């Protein structure tokens, strides 16, 4: 994994002092420094004819070097990137909100990559306009066939800030079945931050626990998506990585985590508010956990 402790890991107390020294504007300027690094890689596949219409946004391509390729195809392209996590290669697949013409690519990827958990941090529509297609059967007994993959809704639970849907994917060619858990987090708008650090952190543990549970019943990546799959996606994953290192080693480094992530899912973390939120969420967590 690219996410290893070295070489400037900070303790929680050093983090407090760091954020205090820099303040919000210092943190915002730190995000700008990140933004300025020239991306390591290229975007040719994303920009090819045939693939252009498979991108939700003209300004959010994906890296050639880390993209998830579709094997059982009409191209091998989906706007989706393999992302390392804390001491774990390919812990996530970061991807855009599926389009009607990419629903079947999305499910092929989920099948092919043995995905057990999907994390969605967007509503279908936010502030008037379309953000993500309805790519899964919304109601309990509904099904949708995507070629040889049939997806059936087995039940929906509503929670304070997210909904948990259990799906069965039935590959009717191979005659195999797998359950996948779909989590939709509802209170995190594009371009913004969640209404509460605590709700997102609770949400993260729920997701973690489901992934661990699923894996024991069988490591596959967790699919994490938003609309573009860079802003909220990068923030979610970056927080996950930092909290994991904090738990295990009592250290972290936000700048390093985000910089590294952007070499894998290009453009991860889309605003300085999101970047600052990562530091703030970690510190709020620390305080509530008594490292304050």
């Amino acid at each position: 994994s690219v996410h290893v402790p070295g070489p400037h890991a900070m303790t929680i107390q050093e983090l407090v002092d760091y954020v205090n020294a820099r303040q919000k504007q210092g943190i915002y300027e730190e995000y700008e420094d990140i933004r300025r690094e020239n991306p390591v890689g290229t975007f040719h596949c994303s920009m090819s004819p045939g693939n252009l219409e498979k991108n939700r946004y003209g300004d959010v391509p994906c890296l050639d070097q880390t993209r998830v390729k579709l094997t059982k195809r009409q191209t091998d392209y989906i706007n989706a990137s393999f992302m390392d996590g804390y001491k774990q290669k390919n812990a996530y697949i970061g991807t855009q909100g599926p389009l009607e013409n990419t629903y079947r690519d999305f499910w092929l990827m989920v099948w092919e990559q043995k995905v057990l958990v999907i994390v969605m941090t967007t509503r279908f529509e936010e502030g008037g306009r379309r953000k993500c297609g309805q790519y899964w059967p919304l109601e309990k007994d509904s099904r949708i066939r995507f070629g040889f993959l049939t997806v059936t809704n087995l039940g929906v639970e509503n929670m304070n800030h997210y909904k948990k849907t259990t799906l069965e994917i039935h590959n009717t060619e191979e005659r195999q079945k797998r359950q996948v858990t779909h989590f939709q987090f509802l209170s995190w708008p594009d371009y913004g931050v969640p209404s509460s650090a605590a709700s997102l952190i609770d949400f993260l543990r729920v997701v973690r626990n489901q992934q661990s549970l699923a894996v024991s019943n069988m490591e596959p990546p967790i699919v994490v998506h938003c609309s573009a799959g860079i802003g909220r996606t990068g923030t979610f994953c970056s927080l996950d990585i930092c909290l994991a290192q904090l738990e295990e080693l009592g250290t972290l480094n936000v700048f390093q985590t985000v910089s590294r992530m952007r070499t894998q899912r290009a453009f991860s973390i889309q605003t300085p508010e999101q970047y600052y939120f990562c530091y703030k969420a970690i510190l709020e967590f620390a305080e509530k956990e008594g490292m304050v």
């Binding site: 939700r56 946004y57 003209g58 300004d59 959010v60 306009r129 379309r130 953000k131 609309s227 573009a228 860079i230 802003g231 889309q270």
Partner: peptide
């Protein structure tokens, strides 16, 4: 959508 930014 058509541009994210």
């Amino acid at each position: 959508n058509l541009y994210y930014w």
